[PDB]
Amino acid sequence: GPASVPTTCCFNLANRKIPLQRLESYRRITSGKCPQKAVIFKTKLAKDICADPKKKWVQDSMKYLDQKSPTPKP
């Protein structure tokens, strides 16, 4: 099933933001991996991006994905 334990996590949170054109979907990091239960906007970039649900582009990014249908799991 899913996985993300291997070396793959931002020191914490990003900074400026992420372009909506590349951004695909978001995902939360619970369990214990990565700091805080922050959302992870993934894109065709080359790696995962960390961001806490506080900064504007963070709440606005997922809010924009709400309109469309990212086609998530059942």
């Binding site: 990003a14 900074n15 400026r16 933001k17 992420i18 372009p19 900064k55 504007k56």
Partner: peptide, 16 residues
């Protein structure tokens, strides 16, 4: 510190 929030994020684009 710095500025965790600003317009654009890949002004270079070619960064890819």
């Amino acid at each position: 510190v710095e500025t965790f929030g600003t317009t654009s994020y890949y002004d270079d684009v070619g960064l890819l």
